[PDB]
Amino acid sequence: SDSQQSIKVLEELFQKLSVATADNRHEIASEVASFLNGNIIEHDVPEHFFGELAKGIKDKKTAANAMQAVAHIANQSNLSPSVEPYIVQLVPAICTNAGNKDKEIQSVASETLISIVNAVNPVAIKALLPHLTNAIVETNKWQEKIAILAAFSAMVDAAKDQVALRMPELIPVLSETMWDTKKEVKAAATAAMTKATETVDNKDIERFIPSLIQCIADPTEVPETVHLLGATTFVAEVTPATLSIMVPLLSRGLNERETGIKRKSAVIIDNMCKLVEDPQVIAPFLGKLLPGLKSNFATIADPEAREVTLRALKTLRRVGNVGEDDAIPELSHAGDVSTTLQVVNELLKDETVAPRFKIVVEYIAAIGADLIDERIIDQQAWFTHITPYMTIFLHEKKAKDILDEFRKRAVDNIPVGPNFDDEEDEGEDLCNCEFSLAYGAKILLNKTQLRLKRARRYGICGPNGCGKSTLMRAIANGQVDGFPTQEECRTVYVEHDIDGTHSDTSVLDFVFESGVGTKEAIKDKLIEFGFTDEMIAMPISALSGGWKMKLALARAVLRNADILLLDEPTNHLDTVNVAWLVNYLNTCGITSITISHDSVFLDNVCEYIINYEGLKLRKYKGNFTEFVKKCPAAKAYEELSNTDLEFKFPEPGYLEGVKTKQKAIVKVTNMEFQYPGTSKPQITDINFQCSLSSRIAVIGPNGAGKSTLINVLTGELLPTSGEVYTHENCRIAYIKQHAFAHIESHLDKTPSEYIQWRFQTGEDRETMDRANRQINENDAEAMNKIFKIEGTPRRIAGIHSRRKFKNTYEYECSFLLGENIGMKSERWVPMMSVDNAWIPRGELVESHSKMVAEVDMKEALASGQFRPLTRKEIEEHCSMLGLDPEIVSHSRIRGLSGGQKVKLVLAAGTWQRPHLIVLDEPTNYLDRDSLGALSKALKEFEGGVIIITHSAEFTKNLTEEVWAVKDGRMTP
Amino acid sequence: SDSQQSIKVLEELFQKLSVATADNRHEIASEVASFLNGNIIEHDVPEHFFGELAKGIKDKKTAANAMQAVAHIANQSNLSPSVEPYIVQLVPAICTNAGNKDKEIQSVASETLISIVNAVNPVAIKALLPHLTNAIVETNKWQEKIAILAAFSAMVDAAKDQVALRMPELIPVLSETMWDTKKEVKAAATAAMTKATETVDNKDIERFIPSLIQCIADPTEVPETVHLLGATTFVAEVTPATLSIMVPLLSRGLNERETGIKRKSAVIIDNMCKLVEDPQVIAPFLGKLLPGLKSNFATIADPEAREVTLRALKTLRRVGNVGEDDAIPELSHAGDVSTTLQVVNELLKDETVAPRFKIVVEYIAAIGADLIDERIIDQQAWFTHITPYMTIFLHEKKAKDILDEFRKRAVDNIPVGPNFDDEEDEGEDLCNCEFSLAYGAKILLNKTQLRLKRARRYGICGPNGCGKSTLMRAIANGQVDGFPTQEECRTVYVEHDIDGTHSDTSVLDFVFESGVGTKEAIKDKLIEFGFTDEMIAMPISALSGGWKMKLALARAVLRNADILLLDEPTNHLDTVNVAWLVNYLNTCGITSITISHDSVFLDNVCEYIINYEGLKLRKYKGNFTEFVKKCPAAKAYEELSNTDLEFKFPEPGYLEGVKTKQKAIVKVTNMEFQYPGTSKPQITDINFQCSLSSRIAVIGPNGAGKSTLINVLTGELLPTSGEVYTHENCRIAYIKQHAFAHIESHLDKTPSEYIQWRFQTGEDRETMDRANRQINENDAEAMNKIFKIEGTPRRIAGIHSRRKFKNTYEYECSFLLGENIGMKSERWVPMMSVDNAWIPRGELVESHSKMVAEVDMKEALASGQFRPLTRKEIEEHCSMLGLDPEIVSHSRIRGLSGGQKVKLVLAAGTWQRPHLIVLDEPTNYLDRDSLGALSKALKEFEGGVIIITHSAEFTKNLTEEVWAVKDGRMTP
């Protein structure tokens, strides 16, 4: 019913929008957006509304208003998943208008595409990109292309990782467009191309990108560029993105007349491709290289060049895993939308899914396919991204049950990665033995293989109690069948030696009694490692952690080790020493094998990982994190990364005057809100209080009332009437699902840089200003916005102060008065502070976010509520929320589990140590485990808690005050 | 005497050269090169030799030979400044042959051009760039154009910093070349344009470079391109390079019929130019922007575009510093070649300068011009680069005195400059006053101005003694008549407050006594800061340095400080706590002023530098590094005392079997060297010994005997007959001026990266293999070089072991036997270990350096000689040579004085703890002060010293043994 009320509101608002003028258009669109994006409907969609919007976009008479509405709805921080798939379904239509002859419809369409690209869940890229590529290749309107190219570029920033995986499909499209007859398009397409290549992210060829882009536009540079790339030393991962910009050049190189170039192309092909682990990556590129390689093999007279051609052809066949007759193996379809659409349609066969929800099911399949492509398989991840879309037409319980099955079936389609192959012989082998390892009648390893390459650095991982250290003892003590003898391959089990020295023997004497060398030689090496003449005379008993390690490694150089064996080497080592060790191992030139619960330390040292899988040893190229992608089974090892446990919210910042916890810090009376343009208010006669003891539950079905109330509570809507008392410095943290899903856009950031990113303007860019486009962070001419105060046109001279105004902030602005506007004598004169005015944040944020931010920092400091973004403080705060400092400061969010992301997003939301935590529908995107931890933490929060849920179970022990809107009213 | 001998040696060599067949042209070139680059002639030039060679090149019959030798003379690590100005002189002739119809002459010519580009002192760019620009613009041979274009590209890597300054000139020349009607020339010009844009170093427009370039090839793409850049947000300082790729586009934009573009063009113009700190920068571009703006401002109707165009014009006038009537300021001439040439000619008038040295004087003027453009004004920097040339026709003494006068005069032409423009950066003003500062009746500052911005960070510098601390103490204590009161702007002299608290007073009470809030509030903030309840309760007398600095800052926050005043804050702080302070200051949101001797700390914290200049405070934008670029007369803040000028060489590496510094580690007997093709040997019957206590002075005038003697001692030339004993692991360090001058190509690197670069292969790429044309690196095509072993043609399969062989090494190679060479069945079959052979280093280095390097490493590791390039090792080693660790690991060589570079070059050269230090004419490029510190450092060196010099002054009280060659004969 309150749900059905939302429908009437939309009709009134839409009716208002349909007749909007070019001057009031934005105002009305914003209303539609603030309302439409809330919890206004119960398990359904505003159908008539979306039907009118679509028909409104097509009709030239209403095209600009309808689309402008779509743009506001598609804002960066508030686009609701309940409406998201119905918005993307309008892209084809909007792309069409981007080709319209009318200068205004074309413009508004272009901007709207950019807005949509910036608002959708980055993971639902597979539902959006196709519309854009379909349009750009099918249209004959050059302006429509320039716009679509603009949207591609925007997508690169909004979903860099997601785009990286679509590169093999996007590059061909951009390349063709670069050869468009229209010169403006040629310009736009190159620009979108240089932008697209930003997803490559490969240090080995980075500097050669601007060269590669030119070859696309001018094939005559092929020979010149092929030669430039001959110097490249491929070491980094050869991803689909790297191939999409490397292969087309190479392919043309193979077809050149000159033999030297055919050869040079073959060299690069070999060098690069021998670095492809998954035959899936190179599969779609083989057809562009094999034919040129076989043809060159039967045309090149010179034996040396021919041998190089064949050498490349073999690598390709190996890597690509081709069959007989160069038959390319069938590609996996795990990540195909078509495949996931089938999987979900099967799980919904018994459910009755009405026609208007079909587009939603498609969105779900799209999200699923991408999650599988990025190999995001953990439960919480899937719940975070898909649950809210299913509940559009299903009850939560059933939704989560089907979602988890969907995830399990989709995940099941991921092809098994092929066993690692050793064509990486840069230097000789240290060992290569077949053996078994038995420990007291217990079999640890059975007929496994061990091959270690010289100067390579390895890490040994495995399940607790599998013999990780027994294997090392065995290698150290010459007890591994086949392993070389100390004479051939000298190993030094660092810091694990055993002698009979006393606790009063000097460091020099100690080493000396080992026979390694002369006292002169020893002293020389000890000094080179940092030991002072004094330290060398003191008794070993006085060596601290860092120096025993330096001594150990110094002795190892004296014995002339070939392999350094380290077992938990970072223990008793301060950060400076660990960094010292990471550095030394990475530059000593000797091979090392390491065991260590410190995943970050493994990531900075290791190049390969020897993992225990049953009674077999399996190698994986890459450090620990890389390894984990290839073997998700390892997300259960006892390695710093995998550690996950409950968390706690921070203590709310001290409030002056608040004697007791029942003392109201928020008090609302006779409040009411009525959207301008509607015939009756959405909520009226509202009264409520909040204290640090509040334990409120906002229940009931979604609707005009419930959503609007919440929208006012959270600061999004300024009430139309009523009194609002907020204690000075009172702060609210609004935990929405949006932040959880949108973190996937920052996978290359570290948890620390993310929190810094979310508070770049002093305020939380995820919850503050949800009623504004804000899609104007890259602009400076829109700072000349003409405000209308008292009937006069004024520009902003400056913002000087701030103050609470109801549920938002007002800012003291000094203006410039516009005189003789539109004339050669136009001039803006400064108005003395007599005319300053208190403008609400919402009216400034779009045009003057900068000045507003500067003023916000001034006030935060002034009142002692500013929390500086220092690494230490960020680290300390993330620790409360159960995230380890090393991960927070030196790991990429890309490697965090779904659950860890929940923690990180939660940490960001509570960074300003809020006094009140309002949580919107937090069962609608969290799983059983997550809710358990969120329940315990919300129970111990020394601040006020407001939970808006549909779940009765979740209110258990978390509520003591009920809020329920009925007919636009509510009494606690 | 022995000098005239060199002339004959060259005549015989040149004869064997003019005849040399292609099959053995290289061997003879090498000879000419190795001998020609040595100290072979006393104060003069092999005039007849350069004549034969000159003409020889102009001749088709001997073009390829003459040129090859030149390519060999011009090798990366050994081209001597004694012959440099003469080689550049042959560029025109060489450019001409780059167009010759003969395929071989055309090919060798292109190579020679590259070789020269990478061989000359990068600082002498102005003496070479012209020959190239002229030729490409005057020729009509397309193959010549391509070759010259390849030369431009090579110059970008060889002289990046120097080329960046020449961008406003190179771009127009390449742009013009992009319009050639030969597709290959158009492509090559584009390629060169791409490589050139690599001097931009400005991420702000990185994504637009392929677009700007494409726009130069098709100006019809200007409008759309302008649209594309409108979204650019300039933040990095705009340099000449940036303008050189931005103006042509914007210039043409101003001229588009469409007003939208005229408007957009100005907008970007504005946003990019208000970032030009030096008007001299934008100077030569004003001519392409002012007329467009003025006209547009008097032609455009739309009232919005007018404001924008005018806004742009107003900005341009301020940044450009234009006089009334828009009079473009007189373009400076301090850096013009003609300007510096006039100066040296003036100081040289009273001296006589034969015609054959005019080219030398011109080279000197070109070098001085560049030193000025780069703003390298210190004395040593000038002696490093010019002295060795001045000595081609003047005695060292006359040379230095003239040169020192050349510098001062040349440097006087550098324009003083325009003052601080901060008003335009983000912030309200905390203070903006004029004041005078009197201390004890003494004047510190007279009627100066001081304006500070909120949240902006400042650093204070000035001569040691000017009163920096007094100014700060004055401000802090509120004693600067005109500066805001505490009530208007709260300041906090961090860690400098005076009160009477007890040692017992607890941290809590201490802060509480300042009256900044309740203990509850205070506690809540301290804990947020990072304090523990354990610390808040403990007495303030038990605080460590780091916690004392934190309590200081924490109190400053509770007092709502508006300005933090720091005086030597990094004192008594370890790296970790310093890192914390840096991080805190950068994120606390409060303004801070800092006086610090730590230039790295200032670089990491300051945004502006207020400097003392007389009795005025001058403000500069940017940190300390940037500040120095603007004000070069400041790299001397440490200087004042003669002692901060010293350094020590490392202790030589351990040598088993050497118990006294008398033991010979090098012993040569009956040695002789005679260049194949020469009538008689250059040196014969040579017997000498070297020990860790040697102190030899190789005296006497330059000659065929002396240089050849040195060339054998330093391992460059392999002796023809005689024995050579070298202790195992013995290392010799060769110090020439070449290294000191060429470090100007690595200004981008940090001292640590320069040292890593020099020893990337475990060997000093600067002094190793000076006899070979190593230039080969990306040349995997000449790895098919055929070696005739035992009469059989073969190819290197692999290099496995090393072994001493006279003054150099030999390598054991495995082969590929050539079968049916020249037949369709030709095949290179791998041979067995049995047929492996030993081959001299000089024969492999030019084609298998990578393989040789690998063997060298495994050897360095086997012997325990290898020194890991860890950051701590480098820092410790560079610390012995007077360089600060922070500076070494985080500062760019670009910001070091010529004196600091001298230390770094010595450090790099002694990185392997050599046992003998051979210094080639140290007085010929070092000033009085450097020599002073060097001499003292050589007296303390625990290893053998060999000084080759003309200065008996330098050797006096230093060396005691004499090596005076006399007719190919010498006896200690």
Nearest CB to A213 within list B197, B210, B857: B210
Dihedral of the alpha carbons of B87, B92, B94, B95, in degrees to the nearest 10: 140
CB-CB contact of B706 with B2 (8 Å) = yes
Within 8 A of B517 by CB-CB distance, chain A residues are 656, 864
Run of H or E residues at A55: helix A47-58
AA identity, residue A290: L
At residue A458, the 3 state secondary structure works out as strand
Would an 8 Å CB–CB cutoff place B184 in contact with chain A? yes
Contacts of A225 in chain B (CB under 8 A): 191
Sole residue written with tokens 């680069």 = B385
- The Cα B487–Cα B496 span in angstroms is 20
Measured between beta carbons, which residues in chain A are less than 8 angstroms from residue B194?
Answer: 210-211, 214
Q: Does B519 touch chain A (CB under 8 A)?
A: no
Closest CA to B927 of B336, B390, B357, B362: B390
Report how far apart, in Å, the C-alpha atoms of B689 and of each of B388, B808, B912, B916 are: 30, 17, 22, 12
Question: Across the beta sheet with B664-673, what order do the strands follow?
Answer: B683-691, B664-673, B721-726
Beta strands, E only, B806-854? 808-819, 827-830, 837-840
Q: By C-alpha distance, which of A27, A24, A106, A30 is closest to A64? A: A106
Q: Report residue A62 CA to chain centroid gap.
A: 37
Listed residue (A9, A74, A70, A71) closest to A40, CA to CA: A9
A560 is in an annotated binding site: no
DSSP string, A840-893: EHHHHHHHHHHHHHHHHHHHHHHTT------HHHHHHHHHHTT--HHHHHHS-G
Length of chain A: 972
User: Which amino acid is located at B831 in the chain?
Assistant: M
Contacts of A221 in chain B (CB under 8 A): 187, 190-191
Question: Which residues, in sequence order, are bridge partners of residue A966?
Answer: A969
If phi > 0 it is left, if psi is from -120 to 50 it is alpha, else beta; for residue A882 that is left
Contact residues for A410 (Cβ-Cβ < 8 A; gap 6+) = A334, A339, A340, A343, A368, A369, A371, A372
Q: How many CB atoms lie within 10 A of CB A829?
A: 11
Among B181, B185, B197, B221, the residue to mutate for chain A (most A Cβ within 10 A): B221
**Smallest Cα–Cα separation from A933: which of A894, A890, A893, A902?**
A902
- Residue B573 has which token pair? 């702080």
Residue A266 phi/psi, 5-degree rounding, is: -65, -40
Q: Is A191 on the interface with B (CB under 8 A)?
A: yes
Coil, helix or strand for A230?
A: coil
- Nearest by CB to residue B558, choosing from A576, A864, A872, is A864
The set of residues, in sequence order, having a beta carbon less than 8 Å from that of B325 and lying 6+ positions away, is: none
Nearest CA of chain A to the CA of B868: how many Å? 5
Closest CA to A193 of B232, B195, B209: B209
d(CA A808, CA A769): 10
Quick one: chain B helix, strand, coil %, rounded to 5? 50, 15, 35
Q: Touching check for B781 and chain A: CB below 8 Å?
A: yes
- Residue A120 to residue A114: CA distance in whole angstroms: 11
Query: Residue B456: closest CA among chain A residues belongs to which residue?
Result: A854
Judging by DSSP bridges, how do beta strands B457-461 and A563-567 pair with one another? unpaired
User: Of B226, B196, B189, nearest to B211 (Cα)?
Assistant: B226
Write the burial class of residue B448 (CB in 10 Å: 0-12 exposed, 13-18 middle, 19+ buried).
buried
Residue among A188, A589, A824 whose CB faces B868 most closely? A589
**Which approach determined this entry?**
X-ray
Query: DSSP 3-state assignment of B828?
Result: strand
Backbone angles phi, psi at A812, to 5 degrees: -80, 115
In terms of phi and psi (left: phi > 0; alpha: psi -120 to 50; beta: otherwise), the region of A188 is alpha
**Tokens read off for A212:** 């590669």
> Across the interface, do A868 and B584 touch by the CB < 8 Å criterion?
yes
Do residues B207 and A194 make contact, with C-beta atoms less than 8 angstroms apart? yes
CATH superfamily of B637-760+870-972: P-loop containing nucleotide triphosphate hydrolases (3.40.50.300)
A304 interface with B at CB cutoff 8 Å: yes
- Interchain CB distance below 8 Å, B207 and A193: no
The Cα of B643 is separated from the nearest Cα of chain A by a number of Å equal to: 24
Q: Which two tokens stand for residue B43?
A: 């104060």
Distance (Å, whole) CA B647 – CA B635: 18
Listed in order, strand segments (DSSP E) in A407-555 are 429-439, 442-453, 457-461, 491-493
Cβ burial, residue A599 (10 Å; 0-12/13-18/19+): buried
Strand partners, A669: A723
A861 touches chain B (CB under 8 A): yes
CA-nearest of B285, B226, B275, B214 to B255 is: B226
For the record, the structure tokens of B623 come out as 């940190």
> Taking a C-beta distance cutoff of 8 angstroms, is the pair B133, B152 a contact?
no
Fold of A418-636: Rossmann fold (3.40.50)
Q: How far apart are CA A10 and CA A46, in angstroms?
A: 8
Separation of alpha carbons B492 and B592, rounded Å:
9
| Window B:873-902, CB contacts with A under 8 Å | 873, 876
Residue B411, number of CB atoms within 10 A of its CB: 19
Would the CB atoms of B861 and A589 count as touching at under 8 Å?
A: yes
Say whether A131 counts as a known binding-site residue: no
CATH 3.40.50.300 occupies which residues in chain B? 418-636, 637-760+870-972
- Interface size between A and B, measured as CB pairs under 8 A: 187
User: How far apart are the C-alpha atoms of A161 and A200, rounded to whole Å?
Assistant: 9
Q: Which residue has the tokens 């027994």?
A: A470
The answer to whether B661 and B691 are in contact (CB under 8 A) is: yes
Check the CA dihedral B213-B216-B220-B224 and report its sign. Answer: positive
Least Cα separation, residue A525 to chain B (angstroms):
8
A722 to chain B, closest Cα gap in Å: 32
Cα B677 from chain centroid? 40
Nearest by CB to A520, which of B654, B777, B876? B654
d(CA B761, CA A445): 39
Name the residue in chain A with its Cα closest to that of B524. A654
Contact check, Cβ <8 Å, A864/B231: no
**Closest Cα of chain B to A721: distance in Å?**
35
CA torsion sign, B620 to B626 to B632 to B633?
positive
Nearest CA in chain A to B554: A864
B683-691 and B664-673 beta bridge pairing? antiparallel
Is there a contact between B210 and A194 if contact means CB atoms under 8 Å apart?
Answer: yes
Which amino acid would we find at residue B393?
F
Where do we find the tokens 């006779």?
A670
Chain A residue numbers touching B197 (CB-CB < 8 A): 210
Q: Could you name the CATH architecture of B761-869?
A: Beta Barrel (2.40)
On whether the A328-417 domain is CATH 3.20.20.70, my answer is no
The answer to whether A41 is annotated as binding is yes
Q: What's CA A450's distance to the chain center, in Å?
A: 37
Give the CA diameter of chain B: 99
Alpha helix segments (H runs only) across A179-218? 183-196, 209-217
- Class in CATH terms, B1-327: mainly alpha
In chain B, ranges of CATH 2.40.50.990 domains: 761-869
Task: Reduce the secondary structure of B538-561 to three states and give it as a string.
Answer: CEHHHCCHHHHHHHHHHHHHHCCC
Taking a C-beta distance cutoff of 8 angstroms, is the pair B902, B384 a contact? yes
Label residue B49 left, alpha or beta by phi (over 0 means left) and psi (-120 to 50 means alpha). Answer: alpha
* Residue recorded with tokens 């890192």: B579
Cα A668 to the chain's mean position, in Å? Answer: 39
Max Cα-Cα span within chain A: 98
Residue with tokens 């979310």: A758
Instruction: Please name the residue that has the structure tokens 């940044």.
Output: B319
CA distance B130 to B150: 15
The DSSP line for A467-490 is -HHHHHHHHHTT-STTPPPTTTS-
Rounded to a whole number of angstroms, the distance from the CA of A654 to the nearest CA of chain B is 6
Contact B190 A824 (CB under 8 A): no
- The annotated binding site of B for ADP is made up of 41, 43, 82, 391, 395-396, 702, 921, 924, 950
Hey, is the C-beta of A781 within 8 angstroms of any chain B C-beta?
yes
Was A950 annotated as part of a binding site?
yes
CA neighbor of B226 nearest in space, from B189, B194, B263? B263
Nearest residue on chain A to B220, alpha-carbon basis: A183
Residues 6+ apart with CB under 8 A from A949: A697, A698, A699, A919, A921, A922, A923, A924, A955
Report the length, in residues, of chain B: 972
Query: What separation in angstroms does the CA of B523 have from each of A448, A863, B344, B506, B537?
Result: 60, 16, 70, 12, 10
Cα-flanking dihedrals φ and ψ of residue A108, to 5°? -60, -35
Q: Does A416 touch chain B (CB under 8 A)?
A: no
Q: Contacts of residue B869 in chain A, CB cutoff 8 Å?
A: 587
- Selecting from A214, A527, A822 the residue whose C-beta is nearest the C-beta of B303 gives A822
Structure tokens at B903: 């230390």
A925 vs chain B: nearest CA distance in angstroms? Answer: 31
For residue B512 the two structure tokens come to: 């509480």
Each residue of A494-532: b (16+ CB within 10 Å) or e?
Answer: bbeeeeeeeeebbbbbbbbeeebbeeebbbbbbbbbbbe
In the 8-state DSSP scheme, what is residue A506?
Answer: B
Q: Provide the b/e sequence for A837-870 (b: ≥16 CB within 10 Å).
A: eebebbebbbbbbebbbbbbbbbbbeebbbbbbb
Distance CA B573, CA A757 (A): 30
- Mutation target to probe the B interface, by most B beta carbons within 10 A, among A216, A307, A528 is A528
- Shortest distance between the Cα of A650 and any Cα of chain B, in A, equals 10
